């Protein structure tokens, strides 16, 4: 946590009495811990994109279904005018 959240500069401030193999080792551990979090964000973004698409779809299906009902209504009304215009031609 502090090993990940510290800046390089403040980190060295604490790596004063450390060996060279030890500094390499500690910096590898910071990289590993940071990668652990990168992976978690990566995968979290994907689930959130899935959810956002699933939601968008749900809503679109709803909107489409109400547009289809407006279309049928309106095509009926138009056809009710057409029969009384075909009936006058008769």
């Amino acid at each position: 946590d502090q090993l990940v959240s510290m800046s390089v500069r403040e980190l060295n401030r604490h790596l004063r009495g450390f060996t060279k193999d030890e500094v390499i080792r500690l910096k590898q551990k910071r990289r590993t811990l940071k990668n652990r979090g990168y992976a978690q964000s990566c995968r979290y973004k994907r689930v959130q994109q899935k959810h956002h698409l699933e939601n968008e779809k749900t809503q679109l299906i709803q909107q489409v279904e109400q547009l289809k009902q407006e279309v049928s209504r309106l095509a009926r009304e138009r056809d009710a005018y057409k029969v009384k215009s075909e009936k006058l031609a008769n």
């Binding site: 994907r46 309106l74 005018y81």
Partner: protein
Amino acid sequence: EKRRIRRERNKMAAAKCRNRRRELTDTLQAETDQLEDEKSALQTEIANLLKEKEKLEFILAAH
């Protein structure tokens, strides 16, 4: 060796798992695209139906 074999199989299973996740996202995105095509076509149809309906109504009323 039963170590090696389980790894080979699991590795193949991970690969399939990743491919399947990607395909399902593609498929969902396509469905969503299809619904937007359909919605857009329905809005156009509504505007035409309104126009067609009022043309006929006004003809019948004027004559």
